[PDB]
Structures are given as structure tokens and as C-alpha cells.
Amino acid sequence: AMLLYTKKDDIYSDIVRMILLIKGANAKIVDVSKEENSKHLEELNIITPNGNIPTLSTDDFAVYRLSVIIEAIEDLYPFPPMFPVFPKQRANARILLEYVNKTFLQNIIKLQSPDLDEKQANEIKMLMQRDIISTYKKIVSEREPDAQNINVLTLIITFVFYYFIKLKISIPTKDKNIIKEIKELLSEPNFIKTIKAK
Amino acid sequence: AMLLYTKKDDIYSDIVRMILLIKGANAKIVDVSKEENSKHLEELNIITPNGNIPTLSTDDFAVYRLSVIIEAIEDLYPFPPMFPVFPKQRANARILLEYVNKTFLQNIIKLQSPDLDEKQANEIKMLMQRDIISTYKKIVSERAQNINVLTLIITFVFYYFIKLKISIPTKDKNIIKEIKELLSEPNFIKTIKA
């Protein structure tokens, strides 16, 4: 059966859990930061090279790295699709996913590290604050049709705004429409469901 | 149109160039290290954060991370396939690609850096020498003769071992024959003489 090794307040764990929810995969979610899951943590370090979090464990394999976890979930559960189904658009989305991973997701992890300086933290916060709206506008520009499903980029950008709040970083916009849209993302039923899954 | 920003004696450029050759992609390879076109190096530093080499550019994007370059090429040019068709094997290939990138590709580019002492260089060489056969055996263990991205990359690893005067640590006649067979692949030769 499907098992997801998670960790508390980890943007990557959260993203994969929401993906698994939308895909309708009935996965066992195990938080290895909890002392009762100590045995699952021991297993993780046997099946993975560095006890990587998150880890999606299938009957046939164990995967780590967000883009690889997504691809493995998509191979086994293609519906609803997380990426565009046409080559050009698919390529663009995967490149934009890499940009969001590098610019936001990796930096969110850095701000949560105990070995973080005052200089380093302000560099990261300034960086993410500068591009966040530009990236958000670019993700919605790619979408530019009712009862339709969400894409992996909208799903991930929602978690970026959620972690901005979590890290007490203000979302830099005065635009009423963008504010309404961000509030609409943060109130998506599957996002709430994932946030209250703990 | 498709534009590839390359640099002389760069393992990553070589790998992408061979992939684009096999795919039959109509890309415009530009060697930024050449003075002939300084105009392209300027445009590269605008579209990328640190003028990263290699960079696969399109009218819609610029990509410089190797695994993202390989995925973007596969999305646009799926034939011939560079990855296993079944999910388990696909997942394993991508993980093994990351291992090869970290253990060898990144270490080859460190040995080519100007500010590097002989002590640091010996650490890297011995490290790469220890795992090269184990990794090679693992790539062939994963495997009518359609080349996949891991075999393509491991070929360039053995090519750069020779290029950096690092001996391939094996006495095994079969492995030696196989490495020699990799290094004589027509598209590899074609890429090396491009």
C-alpha cells in the first residue's frame, strides 16, 4: 500500500498530501517528527539514502524529490491531471514548477533551518517578496469552463502564500482583485482539508 | 526558436547536445566561450540569474538545471524515449540521475575550476574512482539497443575521466569492452566532433 513519510510544518509534505487527496489515493500518512512513529523513521533510513522527507513509498519503490514524487503519483493516478496535457504547455509548467521550487519552496525550507542568520533570513524574505506576485500572475497567466479541477502550480502557489503567513511574511499587494484571488485560493476545500489533516 | 547556450569542455553542454542530436531537435547551439558571439553571452545574463551554462532557451522559457532540461526536451521531443516506459523504472532512473549528477557531474565541473588546489582535487578524484564502477554496474542493472539518458550520461562520465587523466579503476575484460563500446557510439562521436 501507499505510504507518505511526512514531517511537521514541511511545505513539501503538505503539497504531496494535497496532491494525494485530489488524486483520490488512499495513502497512509506518517509524521516521522512524532515520537510514536520512531519505528517508521527507522524504516525510512533503511529504504532512503538520507532519511529524506517527504518520501512516497509504493509497493514497488520509494521516491523523494518533489518533481519525482509528483511524476510517480501522476504515473499511477493520472486523474485529475496536475499539468497541461499538451507538450508545449506541459514543458512550460514543469519549467515554472522548477522556478517556484528554487525561488520559493527551497527558500521556505532555509528560513525554517536552526542554522539561519539574520542577514541570510532578510535576503531570502526580500527575494521571495519581490517575485511572489510576479510568479502568481505568471501561474494565472498560463491558465488565462466550469466545475474544472486545479493544477499543480496553483496548488503549490497556495502553499507558498500559506507559508508566507506561517513565517509572518506579508503578501506584498494592495490590489483588491489579487487579494480576493489569494483569499479564494486559501479557502479551497481540499487545501483546508489538507491543513486540518495534521 | 530553440537556442542552446554551450561552453567548451563542459560535460553538461555535451550531454544536452547529444540528447538534442538523438531527438533530432532543430536547436541553435551557441558556444558563449567563443569571442565570435559576445552578443549571446549578454542576452544569457539577462534571461538567467548567473549566466548559467548550459541553458536551453525557447521563445517561452530558459532552463539551466540538467534534469529540468532533460524533462523539457522529452516533453517537446518524446522520440526516441530517454526514460523507461514503466513507472517503477522511471522513478528509479530519475533518482539514479540525481545520484550521478551529485557524485560525478558536479565533481567534474569542480575539477575544471581555476581556484582549486591539488589536495581538494585528489579528494574528488579518489571519491569518483571509488563509485564509478558500482554506479556503472547499477545503470546497466536497471537495463533493441535504444540508448537511455543514464547510459548517455555515464558515457560522458568515462569520457571526462580520460579528459581529466583519471584512470577507470577496473581490470575486468567485459567491463573494459563495454566502456570501449559506449565510447564508440556513433552519436557520441558525432557530439564529440561537433
mmCIF file of C-alpha atoms in Angstrom:
data_model
loop_
_atom_site.group_PDB
_atom_site.id
_atom_site.type_symbol
_atom_site.label_atom_id
_atom_site.label_comp_id
_atom_site.label_asym_id
_atom_site.label_seq_id
_atom_site.Cartn_x
_atom_site.Cartn_y
_atom_site.Cartn_z
ATOM 1 C CA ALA A 1 0.000 0.000 0.000
ATOM 2 C CA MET A 2 0.858 3.749 -0.405
ATOM 3 C CA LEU A 3 2.733 5.445 2.469
ATOM 4 C CA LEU A 4 3.837 9.059 2.733
ATOM 5 C CA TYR A 5 6.569 9.896 5.219
ATOM 6 C CA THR A 6 5.899 13.467 6.331
ATOM 7 C CA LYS A 7 7.342 15.985 8.811
ATOM 8 C CA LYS A 8 5.607 18.821 10.750
ATOM 9 C CA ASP A 9 5.452 22.277 9.031
ATOM 10 C CA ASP A 10 7.164 20.978 5.831
ATOM 11 C CA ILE A 11 5.845 22.736 2.656
ATOM 12 C CA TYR A 12 6.836 19.669 0.516
ATOM 13 C CA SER A 13 4.887 17.183 2.761
ATOM 14 C CA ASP A 14 1.834 19.478 2.628
ATOM 15 C CA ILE A 15 1.945 19.793 -1.182
ATOM 16 C CA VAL A 16 2.169 15.976 -1.721
ATOM 17 C CA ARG A 17 -0.614 15.334 0.786
ATOM 18 C CA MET A 18 -2.932 17.751 -1.043
ATOM 19 C CA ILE A 19 -1.934 16.118 -4.431
ATOM 20 C CA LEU A 20 -2.736 12.635 -2.951
ATOM 21 C CA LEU A 21 -6.058 13.999 -1.672
ATOM 22 C CA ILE A 22 -7.116 15.441 -5.098
ATOM 23 C CA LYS A 23 -5.922 12.248 -6.920
ATOM 24 C CA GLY A 24 -8.064 10.197 -4.523
ATOM 25 C CA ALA A 25 -5.162 7.985 -3.476
ATOM 26 C CA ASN A 26 -5.885 6.381 -0.137
ATOM 27 C CA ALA A 27 -2.406 6.782 1.325
ATOM 28 C CA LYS A 28 -1.123 6.154 4.868
ATOM 29 C CA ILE A 29 0.365 9.424 6.080
ATOM 30 C CA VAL A 30 3.066 9.025 8.763
ATOM 31 C CA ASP A 31 4.602 12.059 10.546
ATOM 32 C CA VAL A 32 8.188 10.919 11.367
ATOM 33 C CA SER A 33 8.760 14.030 13.569
ATOM 34 C CA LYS A 34 6.271 12.365 16.102
ATOM 35 C CA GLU A 35 7.868 10.041 18.748
ATOM 36 C CA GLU A 36 5.202 7.276 18.186
ATOM 37 C CA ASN A 37 6.336 6.939 14.532
ATOM 38 C CA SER A 38 10.004 6.305 15.623
ATOM 39 C CA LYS A 39 9.800 2.810 14.005
ATOM 40 C CA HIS A 40 8.622 4.289 10.665
ATOM 41 C CA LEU A 41 11.564 6.739 10.913
ATOM 42 C CA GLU A 42 13.926 3.740 11.359
ATOM 43 C CA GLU A 43 12.407 2.114 8.231
ATOM 44 C CA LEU A 44 12.753 5.358 6.232
ATOM 45 C CA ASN A 45 16.517 5.496 6.873
ATOM 46 C CA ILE A 46 16.807 1.867 5.567
ATOM 47 C CA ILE A 47 14.803 2.452 2.286
ATOM 48 C CA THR A 48 16.192 6.002 1.529
ATOM 49 C CA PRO A 49 19.858 7.230 1.373
ATOM 50 C CA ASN A 50 19.493 10.126 3.895
ATOM 51 C CA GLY A 51 16.028 9.609 5.526
ATOM 52 C CA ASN A 52 14.570 12.115 3.011
ATOM 53 C CA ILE A 53 11.291 13.949 3.823
ATOM 54 C CA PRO A 54 8.854 13.646 2.185
ATOM 55 C CA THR A 55 9.087 10.071 0.851
ATOM 56 C CA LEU A 56 6.350 8.409 -1.125
ATOM 57 C CA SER A 57 6.621 4.669 -0.569
ATOM 58 C CA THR A 58 4.784 2.362 -3.128
ATOM 59 C CA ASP A 59 4.703 -1.497 -3.094
ATOM 60 C CA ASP A 60 7.438 -1.358 -5.793
ATOM 61 C CA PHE A 61 9.591 1.705 -4.794
ATOM 62 C CA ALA A 62 10.375 4.705 -2.512
ATOM 63 C CA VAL A 63 10.633 8.213 -4.031
ATOM 64 C CA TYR A 64 11.946 11.508 -2.747
ATOM 65 C CA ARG A 65 12.332 14.945 -4.551
ATOM 66 C CA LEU A 66 9.080 16.895 -5.233
ATOM 67 C CA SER A 67 9.161 16.736 -9.092
ATOM 68 C CA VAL A 68 9.902 12.942 -8.897
ATOM 69 C CA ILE A 69 7.170 12.356 -6.237
ATOM 70 C CA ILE A 70 4.669 14.323 -8.477
ATOM 71 C CA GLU A 71 5.667 12.295 -11.621
ATOM 72 C CA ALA A 72 5.331 8.966 -9.726
ATOM 73 C CA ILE A 73 1.835 9.998 -8.406
ATOM 74 C CA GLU A 74 0.812 11.097 -11.966
ATOM 75 C CA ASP A 75 2.040 7.783 -13.479
ATOM 76 C CA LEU A 76 -0.112 5.775 -11.007
ATOM 77 C CA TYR A 77 -3.058 8.249 -10.687
ATOM 78 C CA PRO A 78 -3.349 10.407 -13.899
ATOM 79 C CA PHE A 79 -6.789 11.916 -12.954
ATOM 80 C CA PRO A 80 -7.334 14.792 -12.485
ATOM 81 C CA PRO A 81 -4.169 15.924 -14.422
ATOM 82 C CA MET A 82 -1.813 18.240 -12.456
ATOM 83 C CA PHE A 83 -0.082 19.543 -15.612
ATOM 84 C CA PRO A 84 -1.323 20.568 -19.077
ATOM 85 C CA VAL A 85 -1.893 17.621 -21.385
ATOM 86 C CA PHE A 86 -0.322 19.224 -24.449
ATOM 87 C CA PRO A 87 3.514 19.190 -24.927
ATOM 88 C CA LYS A 88 4.380 22.946 -25.153
ATOM 89 C CA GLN A 89 2.175 23.875 -22.141
ATOM 90 C CA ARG A 90 3.389 20.792 -20.140
ATOM 91 C CA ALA A 91 7.066 21.772 -20.750
ATOM 92 C CA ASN A 92 6.360 25.410 -19.678
ATOM 93 C CA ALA A 93 4.531 24.268 -16.487
ATOM 94 C CA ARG A 94 7.375 21.923 -15.447
ATOM 95 C CA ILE A 95 9.939 24.744 -16.002
ATOM 96 C CA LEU A 96 7.729 27.177 -13.984
ATOM 97 C CA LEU A 97 7.452 24.449 -11.235
ATOM 98 C CA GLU A 98 11.296 24.403 -11.100
ATOM 99 C CA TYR A 99 11.328 28.218 -10.787
ATOM 100 C CA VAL A 100 8.811 28.091 -7.876
ATOM 101 C CA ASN A 101 10.840 25.245 -6.281
ATOM 102 C CA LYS A 102 14.145 27.179 -6.494
ATOM 103 C CA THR A 103 12.760 30.701 -5.691
ATOM 104 C CA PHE A 104 10.165 29.837 -3.005
ATOM 105 C CA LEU A 105 9.994 26.172 -1.742
ATOM 106 C CA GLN A 106 13.761 25.764 -1.192
ATOM 107 C CA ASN A 107 13.977 29.185 0.496
ATOM 108 C CA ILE A 108 10.966 28.416 2.756
ATOM 109 C CA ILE A 109 12.946 25.326 3.989
ATOM 110 C CA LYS A 110 16.057 27.560 4.568
ATOM 111 C CA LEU A 111 14.041 30.012 6.761
ATOM 112 C CA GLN A 112 12.941 27.034 8.929
ATOM 113 C CA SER A 113 16.578 25.825 9.488
ATOM 114 C CA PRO A 114 18.062 26.275 13.030
ATOM 115 C CA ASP A 115 21.410 27.325 11.386
ATOM 116 C CA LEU A 116 19.900 30.559 9.905
ATOM 117 C CA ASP A 117 21.457 34.076 10.254
ATOM 118 C CA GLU A 118 19.705 37.465 10.474
ATOM 119 C CA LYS A 119 21.392 38.566 7.144
ATOM 120 C CA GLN A 120 20.517 35.284 5.358
ATOM 121 C CA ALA A 121 16.841 35.386 6.553
ATOM 122 C CA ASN A 122 16.338 39.021 5.373
ATOM 123 C CA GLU A 123 17.995 38.234 1.985
ATOM 124 C CA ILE A 124 15.502 35.334 1.448
ATOM 125 C CA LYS A 125 12.387 37.282 2.681
ATOM 126 C CA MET A 126 13.279 40.304 0.398
ATOM 127 C CA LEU A 127 13.899 37.910 -2.540
ATOM 128 C CA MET A 128 10.567 35.999 -2.217
ATOM 129 C CA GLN A 129 8.606 39.252 -1.540
ATOM 130 C CA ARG A 130 9.959 40.819 -4.795
ATOM 131 C CA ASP A 131 8.856 37.916 -7.096
ATOM 132 C CA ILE A 132 5.839 36.394 -5.330
ATOM 133 C CA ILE A 133 3.129 38.490 -7.169
ATOM 134 C CA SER A 134 5.039 38.335 -10.496
ATOM 135 C CA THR A 135 5.173 34.473 -10.156
ATOM 136 C CA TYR A 136 1.468 34.334 -9.048
ATOM 137 C CA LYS A 137 0.459 36.469 -12.094
ATOM 138 C CA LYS A 138 2.599 34.178 -14.354
ATOM 139 C CA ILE A 139 0.887 30.990 -12.953
ATOM 140 C CA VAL A 140 -2.617 32.503 -13.543
ATOM 141 C CA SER A 141 -1.401 33.850 -16.994
ATOM 142 C CA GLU A 142 -0.702 30.211 -18.096
ATOM 143 C CA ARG A 143 -4.356 29.285 -17.241
ATOM 144 C CA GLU A 144 -5.889 32.549 -18.805
ATOM 145 C CA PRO A 145 -15.105 26.027 -18.343
ATOM 146 C CA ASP A 146 -16.918 25.369 -15.005
ATOM 147 C CA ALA A 147 -16.601 22.635 -12.233
ATOM 148 C CA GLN A 148 -12.954 22.241 -13.534
ATOM 149 C CA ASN A 149 -10.036 20.916 -11.413
ATOM 150 C CA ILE A 150 -6.813 22.595 -10.031
ATOM 151 C CA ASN A 151 -3.269 22.321 -11.476
ATOM 152 C CA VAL A 152 -0.064 21.553 -9.508
ATOM 153 C CA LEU A 153 1.241 25.200 -9.936
ATOM 154 C CA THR A 154 -1.936 26.770 -8.394
ATOM 155 C CA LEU A 155 -1.814 24.067 -5.663
ATOM 156 C CA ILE A 156 1.866 24.891 -4.879
ATOM 157 C CA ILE A 157 1.445 28.752 -5.060
ATOM 158 C CA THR A 158 -1.415 28.355 -2.481
ATOM 159 C CA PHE A 159 1.063 26.648 -0.122
ATOM 160 C CA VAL A 160 3.603 29.433 -0.829
ATOM 161 C CA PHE A 161 1.053 32.084 0.382
ATOM 162 C CA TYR A 162 0.154 29.780 3.341
ATOM 163 C CA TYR A 163 3.846 29.535 4.401
ATOM 164 C CA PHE A 164 4.284 33.326 3.908
ATOM 165 C CA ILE A 165 1.638 33.713 6.669
ATOM 166 C CA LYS A 166 3.259 30.843 8.650
ATOM 167 C CA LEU A 167 6.626 32.686 8.534
ATOM 168 C CA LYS A 168 4.954 36.133 9.273
ATOM 169 C CA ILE A 169 5.949 37.443 5.787
ATOM 170 C CA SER A 170 3.376 39.922 4.349
ATOM 171 C CA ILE A 171 1.970 39.248 0.884
ATOM 172 C CA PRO A 172 3.082 42.457 -0.951
ATOM 173 C CA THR A 173 -0.069 43.587 -2.814
ATOM 174 C CA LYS A 174 -2.640 46.403 -2.367
ATOM 175 C CA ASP A 175 -4.644 45.131 -5.431
ATOM 176 C CA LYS A 176 -8.218 44.220 -4.322
ATOM 177 C CA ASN A 177 -8.644 41.599 -7.124
ATOM 178 C CA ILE A 178 -5.345 39.786 -6.301
ATOM 179 C CA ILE A 179 -6.229 39.904 -2.520
ATOM 180 C CA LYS A 180 -9.695 38.330 -3.324
ATOM 181 C CA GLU A 181 -7.993 35.654 -5.511
ATOM 182 C CA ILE A 182 -5.332 34.766 -2.828
ATOM 183 C CA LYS A 183 -8.142 34.578 -0.189
ATOM 184 C CA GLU A 184 -10.087 32.332 -2.636
ATOM 185 C CA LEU A 185 -7.009 30.025 -3.031
ATOM 186 C CA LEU A 186 -6.550 29.799 0.755
ATOM 187 C CA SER A 187 -10.251 28.803 1.182
ATOM 188 C CA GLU A 188 -10.218 25.892 -1.359
ATOM 189 C CA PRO A 189 -11.968 22.884 0.325
ATOM 190 C CA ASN A 190 -9.064 20.433 -0.393
ATOM 191 C CA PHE A 191 -6.492 22.973 0.922
ATOM 192 C CA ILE A 192 -8.473 23.367 4.233
ATOM 193 C CA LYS A 193 -8.850 19.521 4.381
ATOM 194 C CA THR A 194 -5.021 19.110 3.950
ATOM 195 C CA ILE A 195 -4.271 21.881 6.583
ATOM 196 C CA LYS A 196 -6.606 20.175 9.120
ATOM 197 C CA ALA A 197 -5.252 16.640 8.296
ATOM 198 C CA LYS A 198 -2.193 17.285 10.603
ATOM 199 C CA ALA B 1 13.209 29.126 -31.873
ATOM 200 C CA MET B 2 15.280 26.633 -29.722
ATOM 201 C CA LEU B 3 18.687 28.030 -28.657
ATOM 202 C CA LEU B 4 21.273 26.135 -26.589
ATOM 203 C CA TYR B 5 23.941 28.151 -24.771
ATOM 204 C CA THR B 6 27.042 25.942 -24.592
ATOM 205 C CA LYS B 7 30.628 26.232 -23.304
ATOM 206 C CA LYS B 8 33.786 24.367 -24.464
ATOM 207 C CA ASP B 9 34.736 21.186 -22.457
ATOM 208 C CA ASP B 10 31.547 21.325 -20.310
ATOM 209 C CA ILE B 11 30.112 17.844 -19.509
ATOM 210 C CA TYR B 12 26.548 19.272 -19.152
ATOM 211 C CA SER B 13 26.654 21.027 -22.591
ATOM 212 C CA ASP B 14 27.913 17.792 -24.179
ATOM 213 C CA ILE B 15 25.131 15.696 -22.590
ATOM 214 C CA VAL B 16 22.318 18.087 -23.746
ATOM 215 C CA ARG B 17 23.888 18.400 -27.203
ATOM 216 C CA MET B 18 23.884 14.537 -27.616
ATOM 217 C CA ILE B 19 20.257 14.364 -26.348
ATOM 218 C CA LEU B 20 19.232 17.120 -28.892
ATOM 219 C CA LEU B 21 21.119 15.175 -31.604
ATOM 220 C CA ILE B 22 19.318 11.839 -30.843
ATOM 221 C CA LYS B 23 15.908 13.640 -30.569
ATOM 222 C CA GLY B 24 16.550 15.308 -33.948
ATOM 223 C CA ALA B 25 15.695 18.697 -32.372
ATOM 224 C CA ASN B 26 16.239 21.779 -34.512
ATOM 225 C CA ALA B 27 18.200 23.788 -31.907
ATOM 226 C CA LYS B 28 20.757 26.569 -32.487
ATOM 227 C CA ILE B 29 23.899 25.646 -30.430
ATOM 228 C CA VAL B 30 25.805 28.828 -29.408
ATOM 229 C CA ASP B 31 29.242 28.449 -27.731
ATOM 230 C CA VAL B 32 29.411 31.503 -25.419
ATOM 231 C CA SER B 33 33.134 30.745 -24.596
ATOM 232 C CA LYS B 34 33.916 31.808 -28.224
ATOM 233 C CA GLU B 35 34.555 35.563 -28.836
ATOM 234 C CA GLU B 36 32.716 35.218 -32.250
ATOM 235 C CA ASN B 37 29.358 35.885 -30.479
ATOM 236 C CA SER B 38 29.629 38.055 -27.331
ATOM 237 C CA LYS B 39 26.054 39.305 -28.113
ATOM 238 C CA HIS B 40 24.610 35.915 -26.976
ATOM 239 C CA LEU B 41 26.503 35.955 -23.610
ATOM 240 C CA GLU B 42 24.859 39.365 -22.853
ATOM 241 C CA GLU B 43 21.325 38.005 -23.584
ATOM 242 C CA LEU B 44 22.122 34.899 -21.413
ATOM 243 C CA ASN B 45 22.889 37.029 -18.305
ATOM 244 C CA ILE B 46 19.521 38.859 -18.767
ATOM 245 C CA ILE B 47 17.363 35.650 -19.087
ATOM 246 C CA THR B 48 19.243 33.559 -16.378
ATOM 247 C CA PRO B 49 20.236 34.512 -12.745
ATOM 248 C CA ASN B 50 24.027 33.919 -13.113
ATOM 249 C CA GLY B 51 24.605 33.348 -16.883
ATOM 250 C CA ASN B 52 24.326 29.580 -16.308
ATOM 251 C CA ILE B 53 25.843 27.106 -18.805
ATOM 252 C CA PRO B 54 24.203 25.207 -20.346
ATOM 253 C CA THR B 55 20.896 26.994 -20.916
ATOM 254 C CA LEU B 56 18.135 25.647 -23.148
ATOM 255 C CA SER B 57 16.230 28.668 -24.396
ATOM 256 C CA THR B 58 12.905 28.965 -26.129
ATOM 257 C CA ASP B 59 10.549 31.803 -27.069
ATOM 258 C CA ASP B 60 8.606 30.806 -23.866
ATOM 259 C CA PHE B 61 11.400 29.901 -21.349
ATOM 260 C CA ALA B 62 15.091 29.483 -20.377
ATOM 261 C CA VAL B 63 16.068 26.317 -18.445
ATOM 262 C CA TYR B 64 19.555 25.594 -16.908
ATOM 263 C CA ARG B 65 19.086 22.753 -14.332
ATOM 264 C CA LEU B 66 20.112 19.482 -16.158
ATOM 265 C CA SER B 67 17.163 17.274 -15.010
ATOM 266 C CA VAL B 68 14.672 20.067 -15.957
ATOM 267 C CA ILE B 69 16.472 20.453 -19.345
ATOM 268 C CA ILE B 70 16.103 16.638 -19.957
ATOM 269 C CA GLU B 71 12.368 16.699 -18.967
ATOM 270 C CA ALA B 72 11.615 19.779 -21.156
ATOM 271 C CA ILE B 73 13.336 18.114 -24.190
ATOM 272 C CA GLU B 74 11.297 14.880 -23.571
ATOM 273 C CA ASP B 75 8.001 16.830 -23.286
ATOM 274 C CA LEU B 76 8.642 18.551 -26.674
ATOM 275 C CA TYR B 77 10.508 15.678 -28.433
ATOM 276 C CA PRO B 78 9.355 12.291 -26.924
ATOM 277 C CA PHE B 79 11.015 10.090 -29.636
ATOM 278 C CA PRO B 80 13.210 8.154 -29.202
ATOM 279 C CA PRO B 81 12.486 7.830 -25.419
ATOM 280 C CA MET B 82 15.337 8.697 -22.995
ATOM 281 C CA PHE B 83 13.474 7.134 -19.918
ATOM 282 C CA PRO B 84 11.982 3.654 -19.037
ATOM 283 C CA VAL B 85 8.290 3.414 -20.109
ATOM 284 C CA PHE B 86 7.077 1.793 -16.813
ATOM 285 C CA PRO B 87 6.587 3.925 -13.598
ATOM 286 C CA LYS B 88 8.830 1.984 -11.098
ATOM 287 C CA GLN B 89 11.806 2.018 -13.545
ATOM 288 C CA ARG B 90 11.090 5.718 -14.483
ATOM 289 C CA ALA B 91 11.173 6.740 -10.769
ATOM 290 C CA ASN B 92 14.410 4.739 -10.172
ATOM 291 C CA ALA B 93 16.054 6.331 -13.275
ATOM 292 C CA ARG B 94 15.308 9.884 -12.095
ATOM 293 C CA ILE B 95 16.701 9.133 -8.602
ATOM 294 C CA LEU B 96 19.814 7.463 -10.114
ATOM 295 C CA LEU B 97 20.207 10.519 -12.456
ATOM 296 C CA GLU B 98 20.315 12.756 -9.358
ATOM 297 C CA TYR B 99 22.947 10.463 -7.766
ATOM 298 C CA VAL B 100 25.123 10.630 -10.954
ATOM 299 C CA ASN B 101 24.635 14.431 -11.063
ATOM 300 C CA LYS B 102 25.712 14.903 -7.397
ATOM 301 C CA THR B 103 28.506 12.237 -7.320
ATOM 302 C CA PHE B 104 30.080 12.766 -10.776
ATOM 303 C CA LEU B 105 28.725 15.630 -12.953
ATOM 304 C CA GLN B 106 29.076 18.286 -10.198
ATOM 305 C CA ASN B 107 32.515 16.946 -9.173
ATOM 306 C CA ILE B 108 33.794 17.038 -12.847
ATOM 307 C CA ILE B 109 32.840 20.746 -13.053
ATOM 308 C CA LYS B 110 34.743 21.405 -9.694
ATOM 309 C CA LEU B 111 37.956 19.809 -11.124
ATOM 310 C CA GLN B 112 37.723 22.239 -14.096
ATOM 311 C CA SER B 113 37.555 25.348 -11.769
ATOM 312 C CA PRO B 114 40.679 27.637 -11.761
ATOM 313 C CA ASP B 115 40.781 28.310 -7.954
ATOM 314 C CA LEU B 116 41.346 24.694 -6.780
ATOM 315 C CA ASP B 117 44.407 23.155 -5.061
ATOM 316 C CA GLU B 118 45.907 19.647 -5.667
ATOM 317 C CA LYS B 119 44.675 18.446 -2.197
ATOM 318 C CA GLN B 120 40.960 19.261 -2.970
ATOM 319 C CA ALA B 121 41.342 17.718 -6.467
ATOM 320 C CA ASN B 122 42.701 14.407 -5.020
ATOM 321 C CA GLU B 123 39.694 14.145 -2.635
ATOM 322 C CA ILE B 124 37.264 14.445 -5.621
ATOM 323 C CA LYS B 125 39.258 12.069 -7.949
ATOM 324 C CA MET B 126 39.532 9.234 -5.367
ATOM 325 C CA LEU B 127 35.795 9.777 -4.417
ATOM 326 C CA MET B 128 34.675 9.447 -8.109
ATOM 327 C CA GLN B 129 37.112 6.486 -8.654
ATOM 328 C CA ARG B 130 35.541 4.576 -5.686
ATOM 329 C CA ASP B 131 31.910 4.677 -7.009
ATOM 330 C CA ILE B 132 32.316 4.839 -10.866
ATOM 331 C CA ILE B 133 32.163 1.028 -11.470
ATOM 332 C CA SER B 134 29.462 0.500 -8.771
ATOM 333 C CA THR B 135 27.337 3.275 -10.450
ATOM 334 C CA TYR B 136 28.084 1.871 -13.980
ATOM 335 C CA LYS B 137 27.012 -1.637 -12.828
ATOM 336 C CA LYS B 138 23.844 -0.123 -11.235
ATOM 337 C CA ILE B 139 22.947 1.749 -14.516
ATOM 338 C CA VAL B 140 23.378 -1.499 -16.586
ATOM 339 C CA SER B 141 21.476 -3.439 -13.784
ATOM 340 C CA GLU B 142 18.461 -1.094 -14.452
ATOM 341 C CA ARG B 143 18.593 -2.043 -18.201
ATOM 342 C CA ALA B 144 16.711 -3.347 -29.204
ATOM 343 C CA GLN B 145 19.753 -1.203 -28.090
ATOM 344 C CA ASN B 146 17.830 2.173 -27.739
ATOM 345 C CA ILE B 147 20.010 4.443 -25.536
ATOM 346 C CA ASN B 148 18.536 5.914 -22.324
ATOM 347 C CA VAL B 149 19.701 9.106 -20.566
ATOM 348 C CA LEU B 150 21.683 7.247 -17.783
ATOM 349 C CA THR B 151 23.824 5.257 -20.308
ATOM 350 C CA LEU B 152 24.255 8.512 -22.319
ATOM 351 C CA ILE B 153 25.438 10.406 -19.190
ATOM 352 C CA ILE B 154 27.709 7.554 -17.838
ATOM 353 C CA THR B 155 29.427 7.559 -21.304
ATOM 354 C CA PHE B 156 30.268 11.251 -20.812
ATOM 355 C CA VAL B 157 31.488 10.465 -17.262
ATOM 356 C CA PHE B 158 34.043 7.925 -18.688
ATOM 357 C CA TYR B 159 34.926 10.435 -21.467
ATOM 358 C CA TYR B 160 35.675 13.195 -18.895
ATOM 359 C CA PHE B 161 37.643 10.695 -16.733
ATOM 360 C CA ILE B 162 40.013 10.352 -19.745
ATOM 361 C CA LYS B 163 39.817 14.141 -20.391
ATOM 362 C CA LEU B 164 40.900 14.790 -16.753
ATOM 363 C CA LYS B 165 43.613 11.985 -16.894
ATOM 364 C CA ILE B 166 41.698 9.909 -14.264
ATOM 365 C CA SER B 167 42.088 6.122 -14.781
ATOM 366 C CA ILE B 168 38.930 3.988 -14.931
ATOM 367 C CA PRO B 169 39.558 1.576 -11.977
ATOM 368 C CA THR B 170 38.842 -1.922 -13.448
ATOM 369 C CA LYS B 171 40.802 -4.993 -14.660
ATOM 370 C CA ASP B 172 37.561 -6.763 -15.828
ATOM 371 C CA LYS B 173 37.820 -7.544 -19.596
ATOM 372 C CA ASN B 174 33.986 -7.475 -20.064
ATOM 373 C CA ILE B 175 33.559 -4.036 -18.359
ATOM 374 C CA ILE B 176 36.567 -2.656 -20.385
ATOM 375 C CA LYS B 177 34.907 -3.952 -23.661
ATOM 376 C CA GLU B 178 31.548 -2.381 -22.605
ATOM 377 C CA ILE B 179 33.135 1.045 -21.724
ATOM 378 C CA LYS B 180 35.011 0.975 -25.097
ATOM 379 C CA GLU B 181 31.662 0.119 -26.792
ATOM 380 C CA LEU B 182 29.954 3.121 -25.056
ATOM 381 C CA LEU B 183 32.768 5.476 -26.127
ATOM 382 C CA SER B 184 32.385 4.327 -29.788
ATOM 383 C CA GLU B 185 28.597 5.018 -30.076
ATOM 384 C CA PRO B 186 28.034 6.926 -33.411
ATOM 385 C CA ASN B 187 26.017 9.797 -31.802
ATOM 386 C CA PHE B 188 28.642 10.157 -29.004
ATOM 387 C CA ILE B 189 31.470 10.513 -31.649
ATOM 388 C CA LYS B 190 29.219 12.937 -33.645
ATOM 389 C CA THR B 191 28.656 15.084 -30.462
ATOM 390 C CA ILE B 192 32.434 14.998 -29.557
ATOM 391 C CA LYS B 193 33.348 16.179 -33.104
ATOM 392 C CA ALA B 194 30.532 18.822 -33.210
#
